[PDB]
Design an enzyme around this catalytic site. Structure first.
Site, PDB file in Angstrom:
ATOM      1  N   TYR A 273       0.823  -1.236   0.000  1.00 11.87           N
ATOM      2  CA  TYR A 273       0.000   0.000   0.000  1.00 11.87           C
ATOM      3  C   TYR A 273       0.853   1.282   0.000  1.00 11.87           C
ATOM      4  CZ  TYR A 273      -4.170  -2.844   0.314  1.00 11.87           C
ATOM      5  OH  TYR A 273      -5.159  -3.746   0.026  1.00 11.87           O
TER       6      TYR A 273
ATOM      7  N   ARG B  49       0.031  -9.296   1.957  1.00 11.45           N
ATOM      8  CA  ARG B  49      -0.451 -10.455   1.224  1.00 11.45           C
ATOM      9  C   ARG B  49       0.046 -10.501  -0.213  1.00 11.45           C
ATOM     10  NH1 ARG B  49      -4.952  -6.661   0.517  1.00 11.45           N
ATOM     11  NH2 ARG B  49      -5.805  -7.037  -1.571  1.00 11.45           N
TER      12      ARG B  49
END
EC number: 4.2.2.1
Length: 721
Positions: free
Chosen positions: A239, A293
Site C-alpha cells: 500500500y 499479502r
C-alpha cells in the site's frame, strides 16, 4: 475548441502512456509497444460480435465477480493507448475506435451504471474500474463528445461521490487514507477533469493533502519510517508503493490546476523516501516482510515490486530541483545498477518512465556509489532492516506485537502466511533470486526461518491475530548494531519463547529461552529453510567435516557449527552454536502452486530445492543459541567462531546477552527489573532492550522499553561498576 481541462489531460496522457515520447528505434520502448500490440490483438480477437451477447469477453463474463468488471475496462484502456500511438498497427484504426466507443456503451447499459449496487469487491467498483474508465476517455478524448464523457463517468460519481470516504453506497463507509486515498485522487481528480468540475477537483485535492501528515497512531507513515495500513498491518511495500507510485503520477497534473499543493506540505514525501522506502530496498529487492499479502502474487515478487517504488522515486526526482533532484537520481541509479538479477525495464510500463530511466543510467553527471551500511528500527510496525555494505548482505527481522497483526489473509490471498511474523528472518545475499522464482508457493509454511512453532495442522481459512504481549521491539545503537526481542506466544497459546536477536555489524545472534509447550504436538525452531540454486550448489559442513544431506532428515547431535559453502563467498552461510546443540538437516525438492496460497493465481506446478535446518525442543525450559555469520569463507568462519567462543554472556528466562569483544559491544534483553551485572564491567537495571558500546573508560548506551515505547535517562537503567 477545447480548454485547460483537456490541457491537463494531455499532461496526464503523457504520464500514463507517453505516446509523444515513443521512438521505434528505442529497443526498450519497442518492447513495451510490442507487449501492448499483443494485448490489443488478443482482446480484439475475442471480444464478442453479433446479437447483443451475454458477455463482452467470455473469460470475464460472470459479472457477479467484480474482478471481471475491471479486467474488461482495462482491456479498453489498452486499446485507447494503441489507437493514439502513431507507431502502433492500431493507430487511428476504424475498428478499434468504434470498438471502444461501442464497448463503453454496452457495459454502460447492461453491467456498470448508476442503477447498480456493489456485487463482490468494492475496490473494483470504486477504484480499479473507474481508473480504467478515466484513462480510456482521457486518451481518446478526441473521439468522444463531452456529453458521452459525462454519461460514462456518471457511474463513478454514484459509487464515489465523497473524496474523504470509500464504500459510501454500502451500509458501512470507511475513511480514505494511505495508498487508497492517493487512488481516490486518480479516480476523482481525473473524473473531475473529464467532467470539467472545479468543485470535484479542489475538494479531492484538499482530501489528498491529508496524505502528507505523519501520524503517531493508525494508518499512515510514521516518524520512525514505519507505514501502517489496514488498521494495524506493516505495509510499506504494497500500500505504501501504491501511494508513492500514484502520487508521483498525479502531482505534475495537480500542480498546474487552480488548486496546487503547497511546496511546504509536500516536503514529507522526501521523509518517506529516505526513512520508509530506501531501507527496505536491498540489491533491487523490496523486502517481503513489508508487502503483506502481495507476497502471494506470482507477478509481484520482490524485485518486481521494488520497481513500483523506484519509478515513483524517479518521478519525484524529476519534479524536484538542485541537490534534492541530484540525490534522488543517485539513489535510484545505484539501486538499479546493483540489481544483477532483475531487468528494471520489465516493470516500467509507460514510455516516459522508460525514457527517464535510460537518461539516468547514461548520465555520467549522476553519481552511482554503492549504498553505505544502515540499520532501521521500524518499531511502530515491529520490523527491523539491516544492511552491511562492507560485506554486502542485508537482514530483515519480521515481528508483530499487541500493536500489529501477524499476517494478512484477505481476498483469498496469502492463505499460508501464518508464521511470517513469528520471529521470521530474511537474509539478502549474493543470491538475489532467493525469495523469487517461486519461493513463496514452494517454501514449507510450517517451517518459516527463525520461527519457533509446534507441528499442529493449520487451516487456510484462518486469519491474522495480534500478539498478547507488548514486549516486542528493537534498541538501535548505531548504523551497525542493535538488539531486539519478542515475548512470543503461538497462535493457540500452547507455546512460548523469549526470542531475542543481537545484530552485531557482520553477524546476528539468535537466542531463545523459556521454551514451553502444553500441547501434545512437537515443538522446534527452524534455524533455516534456504532455497537453493541448481547452478550454484552448496557444500555442507558440520563441525568442519563435509556432510551429505538427503531428502530424509538426518540428526546431528553435539553440533558446534554448520557451514554452507558456495563458490561465491557472498552466498556463504555459517551457523555457530554457542553451546553444542542437537539439530536436524535435509535437502529436498518442494513442489506447490501459486494457487495453493492465492485463489486468483495459476495452478501450474512449481518446484524448488530447499535446505532445512531445525532444532527440536522436547522439554519445558528448553533454549537455543547460535550466531549467523554470512559472506565469509570457510577458513575465516572457523577463525571467527574461535574468537566468539565466550561471546554468550547469558541465555535464561530473565536475561539474554551476547558480547562482541572485537567491537566492544554488548546486546542485552532483560525481562525483569533485577540488577544484572555484565562482564564484571557494568550493571543494567530495568526490563527492556539494550545495545551498549565501550570506548575507552566511556560507555555509549541505547535503551528501549518496548512496552511503553520509550527510552529512559542513563542513570535509571545503567551503572558503571
Amino acid at each position: 475548441v477545447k480548454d485547460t481541462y483537456t490541457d491537463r489531460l494531455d499532461d496526464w496522457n503523457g504520464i500514463i502512456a507517453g505516446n509523444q515520447y515513443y521512438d521505434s528505434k528505442n529497443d526498450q520502448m519497442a518492447k513495451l509497444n510490442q507487449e501492448l500490440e499483443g494485448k490489443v490483438a488478443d482482446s480484439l480477437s475475442s471480444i464478442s460480435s453479433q446479437a447483443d451477447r451475454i458477455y463482452l469477453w467470455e473469460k470475464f463474463s460472470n459479472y457477479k465477480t467484480s474482478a471481471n468488471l475491471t479486467a474488461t475496462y482495462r482491456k479498453l484502456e489498452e486499446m485507447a493507448k494503441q489507437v493514439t500511438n502513431p507507431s502502433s498497427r492500431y493507430y487511428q484504426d476504424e475498428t478499434v475506435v468504434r470498438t471502444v466507443r461501442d464497448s463503453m456503451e454496452w457495459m454502460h447499459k447492461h453491467v456498470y451504471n448508476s442503477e447498480k449496487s456493489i456485487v463482490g469487491n468494492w475496490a473494483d467498483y470504486e477504484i480499479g474500474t473507474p481508473r480504467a474508465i478515466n484513462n480510456t476517455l482521457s486518451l481518446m478524448k478526441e473521439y468522444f463528445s463531452d456529453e458521452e464523457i459525462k454519461k460514462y463517468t456518471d457511474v463513478i460519481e454514484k459509487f464515489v461521490p465523497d473524496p474523504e470516504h470509500f464504500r459510501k453506497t454500502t451500509d458501512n463507509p470507511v475513511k480514505a487514507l494511505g495508498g487508497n486515498l492517493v487512488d481516490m485522487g486518480r479516480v476523482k481528480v481525473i473524473a473531475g477533469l473529464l467532467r470539467k468540475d472545479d468543485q470535484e477537483i479542489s475538494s479531492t485535492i484538499r482530501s489528498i493533502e491529508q496524505v502528507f501528515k505523519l501520524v503517531d497512531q493508525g494508518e499512515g507513515f510514521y516518524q520512525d519510517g514505519s507505514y501502517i495500513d489496514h488498521t494495524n498491518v506493516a505495509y510499506t511495500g504494497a500500500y505504501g508503493n501504491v501511494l508513492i507510485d500514484g502520487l508521483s503520477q498525479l502531482l505534475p497534473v495537480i500542480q498546474k490546476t487552480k488548486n496546487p499543493i503547497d511546496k511546504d506540505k509536500m516536503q514529507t514525501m522526501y521523509h518517506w523516501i529516505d526513512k520508509s522506502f530506501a531501507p527496505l530496498l536491498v540489491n533491487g529487492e523490496l523486502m517481503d516482510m513489508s508487502r503483506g499479502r502481495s507476497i502471494s502474487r506470482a507477478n509481484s515478487e520482490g524485485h518486481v515490486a521494488a520497481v513500483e517504488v523506484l519509478r515513483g522515486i524517479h518521478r519525484i526526482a524529476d519534479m524536484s530541483e538542485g541537490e534534492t533532484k541530484q540525490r534522488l537520481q543517485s539513489l535510484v541509479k545505484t539501486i538499479v545498477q546493483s540489481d544483477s538479477y532483475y531487468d528494471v525495464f520489465k516493470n516500467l510500463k509507460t514510455y516516459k518512465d522508460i525514457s527517464l530511466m535510460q537518461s539516468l543510467l547514461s548520465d555520467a553527471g549522476v553519481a552511482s556509489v554503492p549504498r553505505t551500511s544502515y540499520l532501521s528500527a521500524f518499531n511502530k510496525m515491529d520490523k527491523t532492516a539491516m544492511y552491511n555494505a562492507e560485506k554486502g548482505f542485508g537482514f530483515g527481522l519480521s515481528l508483530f506485537s499487541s500493536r500489529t497483526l501477524n499476517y494478512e489473509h484477505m481476498n483469498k490471498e496469502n492463505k499460508r502466511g501464518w508464521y511470517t511474523s513469528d520471529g521470521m528472518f530474511y537474509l539478502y545475499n549474493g543470491d538475489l533470486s532467493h525469495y523469487s522464482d517461486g519461493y513463496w508457493p514452494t517454501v514449507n509454511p510450517y517451517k518459516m526461518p527463525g520461527t519457533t512453532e509446534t507441528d499442529a495442522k493449520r487451516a487456510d481459512s484462518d486469519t491474522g491475530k495480534v500478539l498478547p504481549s507488548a514486549f516486542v521491539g528493537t534498541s538501535k545503537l548505531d548504523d551497525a548494531n542493535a538488539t531486539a526481542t519478542m515475548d512470543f506466544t503461538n497462535w493457540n497459546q500452547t507455546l512460548t519463547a523469549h526470542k531475542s536477536w543481537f545484530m552485531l555489524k557482520d553477524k546476528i545472534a539468535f537466542l531463545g529461552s523459556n521454551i514451553q509447550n502444553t500441547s501434545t504436538d512437537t515443538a522446534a525452531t527452524t534455524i533455516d529453510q534456504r532455497k537453493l540454486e541448481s547452478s550454484n550448489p552448496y557444500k555442507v559442513y558440520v563441525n568442519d567435516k563435509e556432510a551429505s544431506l538427503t531428502e530424509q532428515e538426518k540428526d546431528y547431535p553435539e553440533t558446534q557449527s554448520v557451514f554452507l559453502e558456495s563458490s561465491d563467498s557472498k552466498k556463504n552461510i555459517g551457523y555457530f552454536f554457542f553451546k553444542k546443540s542437537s539439530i536436524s538437516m535435509s535437502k529436498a525438492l518442494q513442489k506447490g502452486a501459486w494457487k495453493d496460497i492465492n485463489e486468483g493465481q495459476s495452478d501450474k506446478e512449481v518446484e524448488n530445492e530447499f535446505l532445512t535446518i531445525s532444532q527440536a525442543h522436547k522439554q519445558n525450559g528448553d533454549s537455543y543459541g547460535y550466531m549467523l555469520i554470512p559472506n565469509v569463507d570457510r577458513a575465516t568462519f572457523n577463525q571467527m567462531i574461535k574468537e566468539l567462543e565466550s561471546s554468550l554472556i547469558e541465555n535464561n528466562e530473565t536475561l539474554q546477552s551476547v558480547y562482541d569483544a572485537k567491537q566492544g559491544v554488548w546486546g542485552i534483553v532483560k525481562y525483569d527489573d533485577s540488577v544484572s551485572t555484565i562482564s564484571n564491567q557494568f550493571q543494567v537495571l530495568k526490563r527492556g532492550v539494550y545495545t551498549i558500546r565501550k570506548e575507552g573508560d566511556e560507555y555509549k548506551i541505547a535503551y528501549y522499553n518496548p512496552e511503553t515505547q520509550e527510552s529512559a535517562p542513563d542513570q535509571e537503567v545503567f551503572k558503571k561498576l
